[PDB]
Amino acid sequence: GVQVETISPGDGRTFPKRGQTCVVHYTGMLEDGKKFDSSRDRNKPFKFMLGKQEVIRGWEEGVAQMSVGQRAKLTISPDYAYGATGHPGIIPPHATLVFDVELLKLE
Amino acid sequence: YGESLCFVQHVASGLWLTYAAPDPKALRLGVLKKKAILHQEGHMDDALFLTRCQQEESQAARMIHSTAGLYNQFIKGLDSFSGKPRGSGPPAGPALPIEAVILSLQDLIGYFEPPSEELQHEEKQSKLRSLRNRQSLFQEEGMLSLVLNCIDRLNVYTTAAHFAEYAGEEAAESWKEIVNLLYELLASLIRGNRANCALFSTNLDWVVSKLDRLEASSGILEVLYCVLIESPEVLNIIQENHIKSIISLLDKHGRNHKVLDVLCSLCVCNGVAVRSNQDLITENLLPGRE
Amino acid sequence: ACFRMTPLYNLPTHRACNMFLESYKAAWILTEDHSFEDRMIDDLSKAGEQEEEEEEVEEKKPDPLHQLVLHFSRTALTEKSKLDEDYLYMAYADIMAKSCHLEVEVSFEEKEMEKQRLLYQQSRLHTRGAAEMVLQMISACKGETGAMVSSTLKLGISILNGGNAEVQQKMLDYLKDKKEVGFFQSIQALMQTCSVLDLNAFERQNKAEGLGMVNEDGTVINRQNGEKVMADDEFTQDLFRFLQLLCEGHNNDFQNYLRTQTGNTTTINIIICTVDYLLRLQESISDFYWYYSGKDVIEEQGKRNFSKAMSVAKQVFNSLTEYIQGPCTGNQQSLAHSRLWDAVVGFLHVFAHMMMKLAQDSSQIELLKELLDLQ
Amino acid sequence: MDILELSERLDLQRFHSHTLRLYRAVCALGNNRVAHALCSHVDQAQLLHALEDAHLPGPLRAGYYDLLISIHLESACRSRRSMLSEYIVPLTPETRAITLFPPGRKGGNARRHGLPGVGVTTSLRPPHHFSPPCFVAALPAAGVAEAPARLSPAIPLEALRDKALRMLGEAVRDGGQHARDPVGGSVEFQFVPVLKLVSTLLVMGIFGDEDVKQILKMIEPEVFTEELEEGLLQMKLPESVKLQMCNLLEYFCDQELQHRVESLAAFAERYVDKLQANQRSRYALLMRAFTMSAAETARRTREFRSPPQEQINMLLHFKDEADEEDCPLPEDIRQDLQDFHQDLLAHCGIQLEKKPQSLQELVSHMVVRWAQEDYVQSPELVRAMFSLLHRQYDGLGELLRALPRAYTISPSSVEDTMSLLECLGQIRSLLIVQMGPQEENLMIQSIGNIMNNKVFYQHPNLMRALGMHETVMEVMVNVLGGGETKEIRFPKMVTSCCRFLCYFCRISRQNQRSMFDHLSYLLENSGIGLGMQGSTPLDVAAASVIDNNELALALQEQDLEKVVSYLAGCGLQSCPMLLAKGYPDIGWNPCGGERYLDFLRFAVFVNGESVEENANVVVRLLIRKPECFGPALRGEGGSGLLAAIEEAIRISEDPARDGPGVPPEENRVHLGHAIMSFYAALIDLLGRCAPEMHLIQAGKGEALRIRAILRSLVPLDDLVGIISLPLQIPTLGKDGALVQPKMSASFVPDHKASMVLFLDRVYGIENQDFLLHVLDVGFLPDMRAAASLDTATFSTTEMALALNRYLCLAVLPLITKCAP
Amino acid sequence: LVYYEGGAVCTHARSLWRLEPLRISWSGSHLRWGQPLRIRHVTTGRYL
């Protein structure tokens, strides 16, 4: 349900394995392309733990498909994403999301 | 005048004006309002003490007495021509005194200035509680309700021409400024009035329904603005539909500092916030960004 | 427990430090005397470089004290359904009261110099609107007993001590121009809510010290509070002293104004209401007479209650004397037709039986002296 | 469009400013969810670069600054201010180290006053809780408005601190330049937002010590020099900027007072240790001094026999010099105390070059100079000015006021006090916002944590100084205000309101004293507590008055009068909740009357004795209000109390007369047993209100006539009949199952116990044959009931235990005194 | 019907009442004991 477009190629031999923390650097846009959240905004990379599902399960699927050292554009369908409810206030209900992800370093 | 103790006697009857005393079961009702009767025996406390009233209060009472009758005649005329459209025919009845009504309105607002801010604090406060006192009396005899009746009976007709086919063509040109000045008068009466804002707290749906009307959008919006500022209870009674209606009003009438200030006042009041109202405002307005 | 107590060295250190902090507070901070009101007020009154500019004096810009007084006046004139507590106004009213009063053979020149200094200290404030601000603040008090009106009346006393004729004239003119009945309505309400002696409260207090069980904090057996009887005796005293100072100097115009106000839409009689309070106090003193004659000898707590009530009654009688002197014929006739006579007869029989029972025993000699003073 | 073009286009700029105001309003007052939403809507780097940019128009600049405050700074600032108002000092070696004045080459008495805000402030302050704002995480599974509210968005505090400091440096540079073009179009627009951000950061406390030094240097260099340039004070400002300046300096003086308090607490620690060591040495010489001297030993003893508070009082009492020679404390432990006292006098300024070189004279001079420069037109600035002036001129009196608020805590319980203070901060923040479901859940869990908290039991004076009960009553009354007559929102909330404060009652009697001080305030709001089921403000007042005879004596006749007026109303008519729920109608309300009657019982009977004045005035109120008797003992056309009890038992047997007829919730009371409970409580009230036997032999006429009036109003034959009445006992039925008639549906022996209590209190028991017939008609049914009770199944059921208490409280003492 | 009431209604203009002497001229002359007169409520305009 996640559409992947590799802006910069990953190495292909190093991959995020379930049960390993990921340090990514992301930019989130809306359907029409408006940016609501981004790691660029915080200026600090976003750290998340694979397998605890603390973030959207479709997004963990996309990151798992991703290789290390990679720049990509991920379109998440609503059913994997927030869904019909969206994010109250931040993302309008029943809206799909498209994220831009940097993966500089993996620990 | 102000120190004498006086009995009042009736020439024709020859009996004594007395109080009927608390009759049985009036204690159970709990009403302290008790009837006067006329009997030669009378009661011990039949003597009356007479006390002064201010000339401002006397003038207010006289203008109330005249205004009630005038706008009552206006409402009866409204009812008279409401039933049947006059069409291409004269109303065949006494035309409502449109010019007298006009003059009465600007006379009332001229009675209802807001105090000029340049005035010093003493006279500012003086005219402030004087205006509050006049507003309290005027809502007490309830000419505000009469204004509500006039507003409703005018706004049942959407357009000046639509009013004209029922009432007459000569009123159509006056009709726009008539309704505008009537809303302005209501705003002047209710601004800074606890009783009036409590009345709108009882019945907000009136303003909610007539806000969408174009003919007096500014006046109705200012009315709602004053009610929201002065009354916190209206903010409590507001539900999601009202907030969506205000947002739709901003959409249909375009960007407006007054409307945005109305929303700001709706958000917070008297330093206490309604989280449900804030959440509804957020969810309805912000996520779109358009 | 005398042996049981944990000795302070074995006692826990934090609770001991709380104990010692409270002890040092009570024994040192209260006992330390700090005099700052005079210097505060004179520094505020002094206007630097105002005459140097000489255009701002022509504009008549208020000096800091006048600015503060006008701020208090603005707050008073601001209308609220409920009066607002102002710690700043309490602090400043206390400061101004000290600045005015500032208070064994004394000669004529020294007495005159003290009088002139008192007049100048009163001048520094009343020339700045103090009297009008006091009247406004009573009007804002609206007759609710509180620190608001307590400080306001204390400032009024401090500015009117010695019968300041110019302050009296300014107050009378302000009342005649604003011409608002709310001030007198507040006075009447406060003087009605002034308390009277209560046998029931006195007996409840008596059983209170009789029982006197220990307080939970530490060991405090029979902790004594301010007596419920005559809780507001100081307020009644300084209110009647305010009326006395207002009528001081035989100011016939203000005495007549207190009797009746001609132009005000509604007029109330401070003289008659004061007579009513005096009559109520007389009935209360008669109740204490009956209770005290119930037993053989007077106990000390009741002695002090009776003495404080007698001080209140003395203040009332001095106020009435200041009303009727001059001699104000209208006040005299109104008092004559009033209920004064019944209360006076009551005080007469009460006083008679007083000095009887008081001369019965030697220990009551000081209360007998106060009795003779009241008589 | 460029916002710099928006500067010229004011109309759209005005709309943007109104947008900023709306954003502030929606994120205002700690609505953290909307705050995070707005943090997503408006980029943070946008706010930062807006702070940087000077080309941006002044109104929009102020709008961006205030929006940043209302997104990140507002909630932490409010909580920090609320906690900063109160002073709590823990015990620490660092605390011991800190003093009023830093040591130096300069003379100790003449030491330069330290720069405000430098040093260590041991006062426990809540660590600001911030949430890293990340809106792409998975949605919480927990339901909305029941899950805990989440924290405020995170900000780079240190970078913001340095940026604000260098912005203030830029402001100083521009003030020195006196350039024609101000930043934002006006000096006010240039200074006010930056000063507000500086105020918020200082309130945070993120500003370090050296940062405070630079802040003081910019505010006034020469006054705060440590050992041309211009001062923010001298370069002069408009009124509003002067107001922000006064707020900043007021905050600094708040830390000055905090420094005074903490140094005094440190000195208190050292001096208490010295006193303890001295007393350990003295008592060591005292168990020896028992032998050498008798008078010395006796006067030492009677001194120690005083409570520890009084012992420390007399030990400290040597300032006046009247008994400084008398005090046994060593002259050195006296001398260091006087030295510290003079040090405190000098520091407060009580002791009396041209530049002030002191914060005291600096503030006084600046206020006075501003007053000469202009007459202030703004009342808020005038009030801030004069409040600050009074603070400076007399801070010692303000220290005196603050000391009762000050308190000392041990380092062992500091972690528990941390959680207590956090929950307090949540409560105080919640007071501001109106009612909500999330708010009710949050305060319920918070007060639950406080009740579980160990320090809450350990330090009874600590929450007295905190005064949390006042704020809890405030939230009570704010919840009660809206629509109270028709229905009470959240009786769960009010039940929590007791369990917390009603337990605070249970904990302490000085707590009972405080709620007695606030008793009438609870009383006017008790008009809804009876309507709500469970714990009520009525019962919090009852728990306050109970067990303290001083409070019982101090009880007020007018308060009892309005309570009995409530009783008269509920005796006049049944409750509208009954009418709406549709239960069978009654002319009066039994349950509200019964609960008022038990409140009056707790009022009149304290520590096992009745209070005479309250008993007599309650009798007066009862005779004033005949409506309180309900239908029973009507008077004219009067069906007696026995007949009313008969009809009540008839109604109880009658199905659906007590119930809805449509207790599923079980909170609703059966109407017949409600009537029986009302009249049992009434009879118990008259009993415990009747005077005692010793007063009877004293022969006081009022007591005798009250007893006679009670006997005449309640005839003894009704009591005898009620005692004689057979009562359903839980019996074995339906093939041998114990059929249990529940108390709510059946007449009860505790009502019978109230009956016999009134009997032996008022009517008494005097004749042997009278006792015998009372036994064999009424007490023998009880005793056959006990015969049934002597069964395994009966012993298992709890009504046998209820009968055991009934006997042991009512019949057994009666039988013992009837033994002759 | 006119009733005897006490409260804010007393302050309200409904408590105002007006006296009219039967003689048309010199109505504002001093009232005399027992003088024939009419009573009118100012807001209602009706004669009691």
Author numbering:
A (entry chain G): 1 to 107
B (entry chain C): 341 to 630
C (entry chain C): 3634 to 3736, 3749 to 4020
D (entry chain C): 1648 to 1874, 1922 to 2046, 2088 to 2397, 2410 to 2567
E (entry chain C): 244 to 291
Describing publication, verbatim:
pmcRyanodine receptors (RyRs) are intracellular calcium channels involved in the excitation–contraction coupling in muscle cells and in calcium signaling in neurons and other cell types. Caffeine, a xanthine derivative found in plants, has been used for decades as a pharmacologic research tool for activating RyRs, and its functional and binding properties have been extensively described. Mechanistically, caffeine stabilizes the C-terminal domain (CTD) which is responsible for transducing the Ca2+ binding signal to the S6 pore helix, leading to gating. Here, using cryo-EM, we explore multiple xanthine derivatives and related compounds and identify 4-oxopyrimidine/2-pyridone as the minimal motif necessary for binding to the xanthine/caffeine binding site in RyRs.
We found a clear cryo-EM density in the xanthine/caffeine site for pentoxifylline, dyphylline, IBMX, and enprofylline, while we found no density for xanthosine. We were able to model the most likely position of the xanthine derivates thanks to the clear additional densities from the substituent groups and found the xanthine scaffold in a similar orientation in all four samples, stacked on RyR1–Trp4716. Second, we found that RyR1–Tyr5014 was not engaged when N1 was methylated or substituted (IBMX and pentoxifylline) but it was engaged when N1 was unmodified or protonated (enprofylline). Since we have found RyR1 particles in the open state with RyR1–Tyr5014 in the unengaged conformation (pentoxifylline), we concluded that this conformational flexibility of RyR1–Tyr5014 is not necessary for gating, but it might contribute to the strength of the interaction with xanthines by involvement of an additional hydrogen bond. Additionally, for pentoxifylline, we observed that the carbonyl C2=O interacts with the backbone carbonyl of residue RyR1–Glu4239 through a water molecule for xanthine and caffeine. Surprisingly, oxopyricid led to more RyR1 particles in the open state (70% particles in the open state) than the other water-soluble compounds (5% for pentoxifylline, 15% for dyphylline, and 20 to 30% for caffeine). Because the conformation of the xanthine/caffeine binding site remains unchanged independently of ligand bound and state, the residence time of the ligands would be the main factor that facilitates the slow transition from the primed to the open state.
